[PDB]
């Protein structure tokens, strides 16, 4: 989001939207946990900027808490690759504006 601002052009709104799409994963956690996705992100985004990103969403205690302490770590390749794959595919489809399929 902040980098989207440091770089104008129509790509600005794009980066912003991209970021908004990076909040779904968390929002979903709160969703599947039972807690209101919105009210959750409320405490998240807040407790996150204050105590570094080392804090996430504890679907077990319903709320925010330091993940590093809850021992909820995940390889970098997991997230890393995740963004990639999803990004690459979605991109392809975006370039698809016509499909003639006979039979």
């Amino acid at each position: 989001s902040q980098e989207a601002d440091k770089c104008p052009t129509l790509e600005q709104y794009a980066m912003r939207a991209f970021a908004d799409a990076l909040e779904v994963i968390p929002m979903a956690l709160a969703e599947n946990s039972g807690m209101n996705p919105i009210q959750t992100m409320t405490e998240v985004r807040a407790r996150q900027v204050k105590e570094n990103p080392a804090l996430g969403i504890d679907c077990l205690h319903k709320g925010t808490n330091d993940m590093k302490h809850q021992h909820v770590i995940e390889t970098l390749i997991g997230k890393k690759q995740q963004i990639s794959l999803a990004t690459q595919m979605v991109r392809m489809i975006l370039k698809i504006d016509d499909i003639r399929k006979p039979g």
Binding site: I25, Q81, A86, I93, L94, I96, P102
Partner: protein, 193 residues
């Protein structure tokens, strides 16, 4: 005259965008429910009358009647994610949808498709730049390893003894480690006990 015969489907203009949006968003919303330890399981009963209670997206999409091209694509994302590392087969699915869910917005604003890919590309390239920044490079560290393994054996049927599975995983990888080769690891499976 008749360019395309019958039994087809031609998506032109915003028709192509829309279709994919509603088609993917849906498939993305389906898996999204099975995300996290609280993930909601699904039952995929094909036409043979066989039950399929799985929590993995790839296992759900591999049994879901996917006729739309867009949906099939989402099926190749979880399959690819599941054929490489496997873990998070759900994420990629939900993630892909979200992005598209947002994209549609920019589209209805008059923003051309190609452009949307651009921003999402630069942003992603930076998304990693940051994720690779906050990371805390793990240490032959017996402590962290056994931990990471337990974060993969959780919310599963092997969670009741994720400790034993992780222990074996660590030693197995540490032994054949030299750059670690997954081939030097023989997984013998037999009934009993």
């Amino acid at each position: 005259i008749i360019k395309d015969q019958d039994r087809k489907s031609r998506l032109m203009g915003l028709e192509a965008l829309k279709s994919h949006i509603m088609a993917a968003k849906a498939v993305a919303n389906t898996m999204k429910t099975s995300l996290g330890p609280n993930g909601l399981d699904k039952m995929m009963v094909d036409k043979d009358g066989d039950v399929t209670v799985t929590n993995d997206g790839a296992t759900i999409l591999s049994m879901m009647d996917v006729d739309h091209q867009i949906a099939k694509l989402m099926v190749e994302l979880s399959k690819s994610q599941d054929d490489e590392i496997g873990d998070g087969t759900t994420g990629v699915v939900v993630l892909a949808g979200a992005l598209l869910e947002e994209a549609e917005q920019l589209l209805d604003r008059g923003i051309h498709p190609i452009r949307i890919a651009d921003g999402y590309e630069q942003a992603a390239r930076i998304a990693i730049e940051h994720l690779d920044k906050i990371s805390d490079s793990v240490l032959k560290n017996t402590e962290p390893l056994i931990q990471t393994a337990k974060t993969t054996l959780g919310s599963k049927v092997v969670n009741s003894c994720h400790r034993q599975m992780a222990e074996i995983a660590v030693n197995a990888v540490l032994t054949v480690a030299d750059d670690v080769d997954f081939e030097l690891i023989k997984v013998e499976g037999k009934v009993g006990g």
